[PDB]
Design an enzyme around this catalytic site. Structure first.
Site, short mmCIF file in Angstrom:
data_model
loop_
_atom_site.label_atom_id
_atom_site.label_comp_id
_atom_site.label_asym_id
_atom_site.label_seq_id
_atom_site.Cartn_x
_atom_site.Cartn_y
_atom_site.Cartn_z
N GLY A 299 0.80 -1.21 0.00
CA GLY A 299 0.00 0.00 0.00
C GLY A 299 0.84 1.26 0.00
N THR B 116 -0.58 -4.25 11.99
CA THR B 116 0.08 -5.55 11.93
C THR B 116 1.60 -5.45 11.86
OG1 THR B 116 -0.19 -5.62 9.53
CG2 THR B 116 -1.93 -6.61 10.87
N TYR C 200 -12.24 -5.95 10.13
CA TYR C 200 -12.04 -5.24 8.87
C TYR C 200 -13.34 -5.14 8.08
CZ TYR C 200 -6.96 -5.00 9.29
OH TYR C 200 -5.68 -4.71 9.70
N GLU D 47 -12.83 19.49 -9.83
CA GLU D 47 -13.58 20.34 -8.91
C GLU D 47 -13.26 20.03 -7.45
OE1 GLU D 47 -17.60 20.60 -10.09
OE2 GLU D 47 -18.23 21.90 -8.43
N1 LIG Z 1 -9.56 0.00 7.30
C1 LIG Z 1 -8.88 -1.07 6.89
N2 LIG Z 1 -7.53 -1.15 7.14
C2 LIG Z 1 -6.83 -2.24 6.72
C3 LIG Z 1 -7.46 -3.27 6.05
N3 LIG Z 1 -6.52 -4.21 5.76
C4 LIG Z 1 -5.32 -3.79 6.23
N4 LIG Z 1 -5.50 -2.57 6.84
C5 LIG Z 1 -4.47 -1.74 7.48
O1 LIG Z 1 -3.36 -1.65 6.61
C6 LIG Z 1 -2.14 -1.71 7.33
C7 LIG Z 1 -1.24 -2.77 6.71
O2 LIG Z 1 -1.23 -2.62 5.31
P1 LIG Z 1 -1.76 -3.77 4.32
O3 LIG Z 1 -2.70 -3.20 3.27
O4 LIG Z 1 -2.44 -4.86 5.11
O5 LIG Z 1 -0.41 -4.35 3.66
P2 LIG Z 1 -0.23 -4.48 2.06
O6 LIG Z 1 -0.70 -3.23 1.36
O7 LIG Z 1 -0.98 -5.69 1.57
O8 LIG Z 1 1.35 -4.66 1.80
P3 LIG Z 1 2.19 -5.96 2.24
O9 LIG Z 1 3.15 -5.57 3.34
O10 LIG Z 1 2.99 -6.47 1.06
O11 LIG Z 1 1.26 -7.05 2.72
C8 LIG Z 1 -2.49 -2.03 8.77
O12 LIG Z 1 -2.29 -0.87 9.55
C9 LIG Z 1 -3.96 -2.37 8.76
O13 LIG Z 1 -4.61 -1.83 9.89
C10 LIG Z 1 -8.82 -3.19 5.80
O14 LIG Z 1 -9.40 -4.10 5.20
N5 LIG Z 1 -9.53 -2.09 6.22
#
Ligand SMILES: Nc1nc2c(ncn2[C@@H]2O[C@H](COP(=O)(O)OP(=O)(O)OP(=O)(O)O)[C@@H](O)[C@H]2O)c(=O)[nH]1
Ligand SMILES: Nc1ncnc2c1ncn2[C@@H]1O[C@H](COP(=O)(O)OP(=O)(O)CP(=O)(O)O)[C@@H](O)[C@H]1O
Ligand SMILES: Nc1nc2c(ncn2[C@@H]2O[C@H](COP(=O)(O)OP(=O)(O)O)[C@@H](O)[C@H]2O)c(=O)[nH]1
Ligand SMILES: [Ca+2]
Ligand SMILES: [Ca+2]
Ligand SMILES: [Ca+2]
Ligand SMILES: [Mg+2]
Ligand SMILES: [Mg+2]
Ligand SMILES: [Mg+2]
Lengths: 54, 423, 342, 438
Positions: D146, D179, D224, D254
């Site tokens: 992310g 996590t 989640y 906009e």
């Molecule tokens: N609101 C919300 N937060 C999420 C969700 N899944 C993960 N997170 C948050 O995202 C953060 C971790 O990022 P991830 O998206 O799980 O990791 P990633 O983007 O898959 O990247 P990797 O490290 O390769 O697994 C943590 O702080 C989680 O609380 C979700 O479904 N909803």
């Protein structure tokens, strides 16, 4: 307290209420940074293999 | 399909490794013949992490059994789950190692390592996405200690981008086979400092004390000691064997637990430890989980500080009450957690409890108090080395005193490195 | 076992509160940088309110109200009173004041000069006083030219109360310090015990020793320090007896009613801006109000201090009250205040 | 009509994206199989909903979306989920090993090997657009994918679609569900390299969503699924103007014009109300003034902070349901005389109001109850800088000891990028203080 730009349609309407007036890097450069990082990894791994070779 | 390749070397490594596969094979519903007879899909959700699937729906452990003697491995093949292991994965010599690190690492072990790597290569070539390796061995003997660290060094050379994980049993005079165990342990610790990402320090001194003081076992045996190791090994691998989001694989675990590359030696803890039908509440699991008497490393956590902590609760319990109890431990003893690593305590929960327990808790801590274990080994090492006692067993295999001097300095540096972050 | 941190080592008030909390055996003091705290005795400047209330499983309380500086600043208080309808520019218990920025830098220079000329022409008393928040530097003069020239060398210029109530014997000036505590529920508690910081020199309407009632100025530049009362500090018991023997009245009727009215009006004004009712962290704060009393027994507000000290004799009682209503109310363990309802 | 392409990166982005596209279909009446009975123009059309959905000759309404994750497990859910028929295989991109919560691993190591594939898939959807507006990028701050891969994608998008707008929906890290310990590292690293490439980003602090679920929904331990159902509601309120007929926020351009007078300060605060538990048999329906007033309670904001101690640069009110302009103005006038709403001098003190008559849609069987009227306020407050302060402080604590830095250096990242990114956040915090403080 003024209302301006009122637009209405079938699904809703919008307007503006005013309460007071006022008082990039290129693809080449990105490739260089990506390759520069990959080069530092290769150098670090070569030193490890060199270390394991000794 | 993040596969893990398991390796168990030497007497201790195979006797403990065998109990491990016996314990987790029961949790996943795999019988001694490799057939699945469970009743929950969660058992097979991540079964491929440790098991291969052959013809006939059979599940074959992805384990390699290594030893310079045939004795212990013949017992495994004849043990309860002896038939579940892949016959080709038994790689053994005949000369033995005589509790001699040099024999396992330079002479006898060198003659056998290439054939072990051939089995490792065969197991890895079939993995869709290999996480890394986990090794079970002791540091006080010759094969697990000497050849074990040789394998790790050669495995890293062939798989440098994979995670190296070990369960390393530390010697102790309370449960000692020979006087040269400090020599073998000091030589191995330096190997582990360089070539592993995660090492669970399992101290036979703590295992003995737990059996004697807590479990009330007047005459503990290796079988009693290995019972605690089975339960601990099962707990620390729960996050790898069942669906979850915290420390679900080896690399993410290392990222959360290892703030500095060389400080990767963990103190495992387990709760409960009953000597048995009473129900254990969530507050009780938390207190016992963090209690020194439940630590497997024989180090006093209050003598150091926690760099990182991994907690795993197993069973049907209130996850809300778990969060409360974990926060209560940190908030009530925050002086023992380094303040320069915020939120360094992560908690995971698993619905499936271990065999025979309504619920349990497994503790994984990276504490600077582990230096007490290295100081202990370092003192016993120096007591003999200052008089060059028993060195002839090693110089006879080609080693020089200089290599001992370097191992001594390497571990004294490791102790100093832990000391700087404790202040 | 509650936890708290100390981030203001120069706080004599909360140095005692921290000493009392530890003595209870139920509070454990942590390092000043440990985030897992229940209570923060924060610093005066740049208290990180943004990092409070973000600790899962910890009810966090701080001993300062974010935004209360609007009331505890010379220039801020003037602007708050003039611009707030609850107080209005027609405020009757606050001296006519103006915000004057130095010329080397809105501003009220012209507005101040307009009211100044009106008094000069009207023969009325035209004595003013210039002061600021960066003082120990105050100037009292009847000529507007000296006041503006002094500031240039941010300040505020307000009318100097030329007819102050003078204590007898002595014919001396004084001021009243009231300690007010506001808890997380925004209850306004007025400490029953006040102090009068009196001047040991006779008042002369023509030298700043007899005009400034500061405790440091009276103990340094005054040659009668401690003559009438110990430490130039007269408590309410003696002051109330004087009002009865001399003016045939009481401290409650002649003065205390106006003080309580002023305290409520100020705190009720800023309540919507600083209240932590629905906030993720809670705040309380101890305030020090300073009043002036004229010969007509009228009370005037001088300033409000956000980090005030306490009288030596009253440290114990007041500090214990802080723990009882402000700290123990949020974290219970195993009245000396007057509640100003509103 | 101008199309918008949604891009979901990492677990948080994919799962949140899965929740939004579910809600979109319910709102537009699109069935799981892609059919849309109300759509009389079969196989085409330039309606408002076509900005997010393409149409096949068979009448299927395909979301203009791309899912990217360095791990196959999460996206495999969408491949076999309820709305698996909506998407085609080209829209779902997955790897084998993820970024292990390592920004450098997602940006440099693994990112460099898949960036061209993702762009090629994005180019396919772009070629179906007669007038592409830009992109909406969903991702977390703390994850390795992310954070690390998003910043690399945002760089390339600026190079390949220089004239297109890009908006973010970013998940701010919260320990109660986080996590990884290094999430502050990843958050600051990704914000540094993405700042110049994002026109407008809506941050959602998992801490705020978590408490709203426990407080207003009576969820003892939110999951989640609970968080995303609520997040998709806010996302729906924000994107509703792009998918329905209207005159406020009609195109991505906009959003920047109405919410971002200063480019770097492009992080509006979102506040949503009412959030009612569906477990309540009967609940008193809130009025226009009550829900509008609720937009100034910190307990309803996507990021916990105190707007009273900051200044506003812009403010939009997005109503859905039974709402008429007369009631909105009556509630605004009352709120001015009771709230501490301070605007910057170089900005007018007003509100842009948008009203959609269709009340909010609730996923059947979810936790949110049906309501007659709901509002989402988008306010550009300097108070949101409190989230940067918290994040930067945790960054300073760990980086002072170089804790975990070796994981990033080992992936090829230089230690200097840490201080470089931190210095950028230092300047960002300074910009907020100059605007909102005296
Ligand atoms: N609101 C919300 N937060 C999420 C969700 N899944 C993960 N997170 C948050 O995202 C953060 C971790 O990022 P991830 O998206 O799980 O990791 P990633 O983007 O898959 O990247 P990797 O490290 O390769 O697994 C943590 O702080 C989680 O609380 C979700 O479904 N909803
Ligand atoms: N308008 C006024 N009329 C009469 N006296 C005044 C006055 N303004 C100030 N004073 C006098 O000056 C003294 C100190 O003023 P001020 O309260 O501004 O100083 P300070 O803030 O340095 C002391 P503290 O903070 O302890 O109250 C008052 O006690 C009073 O005697
Ligand atoms: N916990 C445990 N420790 C053991 C076991 N067997 C041996 N050890 C310890 O391991 C050391 C001996 O090493 P060993 O494994 O026998 O040497 P190797 O076979 O040559 O590798 C001594 O310190 C023993 O205390 C066992 O079954 N369990
Ligand atoms: Ca030979
Ligand atoms: Ca159509
Ligand atoms: Ca751009
Ligand atoms: Mg043996
Ligand atoms: Mg003062
Ligand atoms: Mg992921």
């Amino acid at each position: 307290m003024e209302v301006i730009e009122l637009n209405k349609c079938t699904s809703g309407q919008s307007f503006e209420v005013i309460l007071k007036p006022p008082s990039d890097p290129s693809l080449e450069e990105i490739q260089k940074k990506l390759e520069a990082a990959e080069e530092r990894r290769k150098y670090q791994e070569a030193e490890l293999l060199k270390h394991l070779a000794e | 399909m993040r596969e893990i390749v398991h390796i168990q070397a030497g007497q201790c490594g195979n006797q403990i490794g065998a109990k491990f596969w016996e314990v987790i094979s029961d949790e996943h519903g795999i019988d001694p013949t490799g057939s699945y007879h469970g009743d929950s899909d969660l058992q097979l959700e991540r079964i491929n992490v440790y098991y291969n699937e052959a013809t006939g729906n059979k599940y074959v452990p992805r384990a390699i059994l290594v030893d310079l003697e045939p004795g212990t491995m013949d017992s495994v093949r004849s043990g309860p789950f002896g038939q579940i292991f892949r016959p080709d994965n038994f790689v053994f010599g005949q000369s033995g190692a005589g509790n001699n690190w040099a024999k396992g690492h330079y002479t006898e072990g060198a003659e056998l390592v290439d054939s072990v790597l051939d089995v490792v290569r065969k197991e890895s070539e079939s993995c869709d996405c290999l996480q890394g390796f986990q090794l079970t061995h002791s540091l006080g003997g010759g094969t697990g200690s000497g050849m074990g660290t040789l394998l790790i060094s050669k495995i890293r050379e062939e798989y440098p981008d994979r995670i190296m994980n070990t369960f390393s049993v530390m010697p102790s005079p309370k449960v000692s086979d020979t006087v040269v165990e400090p020599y073998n342990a000091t030589l191995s610790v330096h190997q582990l400092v360089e070539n592993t990402d995660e090492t669970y320090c399992i101290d036979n001194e703590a295992l003995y004390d737990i059996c004697f003081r807590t479990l009330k076992l007047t005459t503990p045996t290796y079988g009693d000691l290995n019972h605690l190791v089975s339960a601990t090994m099962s707990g620390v691998t729960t996050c790898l064997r069942f669906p979850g989001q915290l420390n679900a694989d080896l690399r993410k675990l290392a990222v959360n637990m290892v703030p500095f590359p060389r400080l990767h030696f963990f103190m495992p803890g387990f709760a409960p430890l009953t000597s048995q039908y009473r129900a254990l509440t969530v507050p009780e699991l938390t207190q016992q989980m963090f209690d020194s008497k439940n630590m497997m490393a024989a180090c006093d956590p209050r003598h150091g500080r926690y760099l990182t902590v991994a907690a795993i609760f197993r069973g049907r319990m209130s996850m809300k009450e778990v969060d409360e109890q974990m926060l209560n431990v940190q908030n009530k003893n925050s002086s023992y957690f380094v303040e320069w690593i915020p939120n360094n305590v992560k908690t995971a929960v698993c619905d499936i409890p271990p065999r025979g327990l309504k619920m349990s808790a497994t503790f994984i801590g990276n504490s600077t108090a582990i230096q007490e274990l290295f100081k202990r080994i370092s003192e016993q090492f120096t007591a003999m080395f200052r008089r060059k006692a028993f060195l002839h067993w090693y110089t006879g295999e080609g080693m020089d005193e200089m290599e001992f001097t370097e191992a001594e300095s390497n571990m004294n540096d490791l102790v100093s490195e832990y000391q700087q972050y404790q202040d | 076992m509650y936890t708290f941190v100390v981030r203001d080592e120069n706080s004599s008030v909360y140095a005692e509160v921290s000493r009392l909390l530890l003595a209870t055996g139920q509070w454990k003091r942590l390092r000043k940088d440990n985030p897992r705290f229940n209570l923060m005795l924060g610093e005066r400047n740049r208290l990180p309110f943004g990092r409070l209330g973000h600790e899962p499983g910890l009810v966090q309380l701080v001993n300062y109200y974010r935004g209360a500086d609007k009331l505890c600043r010379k220039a801020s208080l003037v602007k708050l009173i003039k611009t707030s309808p609850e107080l209005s520019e027609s405020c009757t218990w606050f001296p006519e004041s103006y915000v004057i920025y130095p010329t080397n830098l809105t501003d009220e220079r012209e507005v101040f000069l307009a009211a100044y000329n009106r008094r000069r022409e009207g023969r009325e008393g035209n004595v003013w006083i210039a002061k600021s928040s960066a003082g120990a530097g105050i100037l009292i003069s009847s000529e507007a030219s000296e006041l503006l020239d002094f500031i240039d060398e941010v300040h505020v210029i307000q009318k100097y109360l030329e007819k102050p109530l003078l204590l007898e014997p002595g014919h001396r000036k004084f001021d009243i310090r009231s300690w007010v505590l506001v808890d997380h529920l925004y209850n306004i508690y007025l400490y029953r015990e006040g102090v009068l910081r009196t001047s040991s020199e006779p008042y002369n309407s023509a030298d700043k020793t007899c005009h400034l009632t500061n405790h440091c100025i009276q103990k340094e530049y005054s040659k009668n320090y401690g003559r009438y009362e110990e430490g130039n500090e007269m408590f309410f018991e003696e002051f109330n007896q004087y009002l009865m023997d001399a003016l045939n009245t009481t401290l409650e009727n002649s003065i205390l009613l106006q003080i309580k009215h002023i305290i409520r009006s100020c705190l009720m004004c800023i309540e919507p801006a600083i209240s932590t009712k629905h906030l993720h962290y809670q705040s309380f704060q101890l305030f020090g109000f300073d009043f002036m009393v004229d010969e007509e027994l009228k009370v005037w507000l001088i300033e409000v201090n956000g980090a005030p000290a306490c009288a030596q004799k009253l440290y114990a009682e007041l500090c214990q009250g802080i723990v009882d209503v402000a700290i123990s109310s949020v974290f219970p363990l195993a009245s000396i205040f007057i509640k100003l309802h509103h | 009509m101008r199309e918008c392409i949604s891009i979901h990166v990492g677990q948080a982005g994919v799962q949140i994206g899965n929740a939004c596209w579910e809600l979109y279909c319910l709102e537009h009446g699109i069935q799981p199989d892609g059919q849309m009975p109300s759509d009389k123009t079969i196989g085409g059309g330039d309606d408002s909903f076509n900005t997010f959905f393409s149409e096949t000759g068979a009448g299927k309404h395909v979301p203009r979306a791309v899912f990217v994750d360095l791990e196959p497990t999460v996206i495999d859910e969408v491949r076999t989920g309820t709305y698996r028929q909506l998407f085609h295989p080209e829209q779902l991109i997955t790897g084998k090993e993820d970024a292990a919560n390592n920004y450098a691993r997602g940006h440099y190591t693994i990112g460099k090997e898949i960036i061209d594939l993702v762009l090629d898939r994005i180019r396919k959807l772009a070629d179906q657009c007669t007038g592409l507006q830009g992109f909406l990028v969903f991702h977390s701050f703390g994850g390795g994918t992310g954070s690390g891969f998003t910043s690399l994608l945002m760089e390339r998008l600026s190079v390949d679609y220089g004239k297109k707008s890009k908006l973010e929906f970013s998940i701010y890290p919260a320990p109660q569900v986080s996590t990884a310990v290094v999430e502050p590292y990843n958050s600051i690293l990704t914000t540094h390299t993405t700042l110049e490439h994002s026109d407008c980003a809506f941050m959602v602090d998992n801490e705020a969503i978590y408490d709203i679920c426990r407080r207003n929904l009576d969820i003892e331990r939110p999951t989640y699924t609970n968080l995303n159902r609520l997040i998709s509601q806010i996302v729906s309120s924000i994107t509703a103007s792009l998918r329905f007929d209207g005159a406020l926020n009609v195109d991505l351009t906009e959003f920047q014009t109405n919410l971002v007078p200063y480019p770097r300060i492009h992080f509006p605060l979102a506040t949503y109300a009412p959030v009612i538990s569906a477990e309540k048999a009967y609940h008193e329906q809130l009025s226009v003034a009550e829900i509008t007033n609720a937009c100034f309670e910190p307990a309803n904001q996507m990021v916990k902070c105190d707007p009273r101690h900051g200044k506003y640069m812009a403010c939009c009110l997005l109503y859905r349901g039974d709402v008429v302009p007369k009631d909105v103005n009556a509630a605004i006038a009352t709120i001015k005389t009771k709230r501490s709403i301070q605007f910057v001098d170089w900005c007018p003190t007003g509100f842009k109001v948008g009203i959609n008559y269709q009340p909010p849609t609730v996923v059947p069987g979810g936790d949110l109850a049906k309501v007659q009227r709901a509002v989402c306020m988008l306010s550009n407050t300097t108070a949101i800088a409190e989230a940067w302060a918290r994040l930067d402080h945790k960054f300073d604590l760990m980086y002072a000891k170089r804790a975990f830095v070796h994981w990033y250096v080992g992936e090829g990242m230089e230690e200097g990028e840490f201080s470089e990114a931190r210095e950028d956040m230092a300047a960002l915090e300074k910009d907020y203080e100059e605007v909102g403080v005296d």
